[PDB]
Each structure stands twice: as C-alpha cells, then as structure tokens.
Amino acid sequence: GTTGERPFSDIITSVRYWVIHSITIPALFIAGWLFVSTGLAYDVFGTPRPDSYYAQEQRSIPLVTDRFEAKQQVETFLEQLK
Amino acid sequence: SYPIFTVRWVAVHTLAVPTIFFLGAIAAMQFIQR
C-alpha cells in the first residue's frame, strides 16, 4: 500500500523539514507581500490603482471598442490620466 | 533511505510555493486604503 516515497507524516514531524521550511514559508509569504506593497503587481498586470479608474471629471468607462487597435486604445486612455 | 526529490515532491511544491506567495500578497492587500 506504498509506492516508495517517504510518508508525509514522517516528513512534517521531522526536525530537518522544519529547519528548511520555517525559513522557506515566511520568505515566500514576505515575497508576495512585497509584490503588492511595492506596487509591482499593479504594473505587471495593468490593474488600476484606486486613483486611476477615472480621470478627475470623467465618468465614462475606458472600454475597448476595437479589436486590432485595442492596445492603442488602452494606451490612449492611460495617457488621459497622466 | 527514502529519496528526497520525487515526482511527488515536484507536484507538491508546484502547488505549495505559489500558494504561500499568493497568501502573502492577499494579506498585504487588506491594508490598502482608497
């Protein structure tokens, strides 16, 4: 009823496991934290920040309306915020 | 004598590593103010 890999229960009660992972887990957590806290996530994914959904006196959605100029359209909307 | 690195190890960490990273990012998000 086993296929050769080490039992999980034996691994996560072991000391060596927690010597590695008490580091690797908080590191990965802090990394994701910084991904957001630095603002990088906004830039990578193109997600608007709370101050950049609309231009100040605009209440229209910057909706893409063209297939092959779509890219240029998004870029045009963003410049109307800069 | 068990092997350390296995197909299983890869499957496990393929899911586990981004999960903790995403959890960290989502935790930071709870302090964003408008």
């Binding site: 690797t24 990965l28 | 350390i4």
Partner: peptide, 28 residues
C-alpha cells in the same frame, strides 16, 4: 526595476538556505 529584486530576494535566500541544509542528502 528595483522592486523586482526586492520581491525576488526572499525567494532566492530561502532557496539558498534549503540547498545548504539538504545538499548532503541530495548527493546520496
């Protein structure tokens, strides 16, 4: 930019520390 290095540092350090602690048994 610099925010990429900030994000990637904990990951590289944790990967380093795991390598250090596991290297002898991975050779076996």
């Amino acid at each position: 930019d610099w925010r990429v290095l900030v994000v990637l540092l904990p990951v590289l350090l944790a990967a380093g520390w795991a390598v250090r602690n596991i290297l002898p048994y991975a050779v076996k």
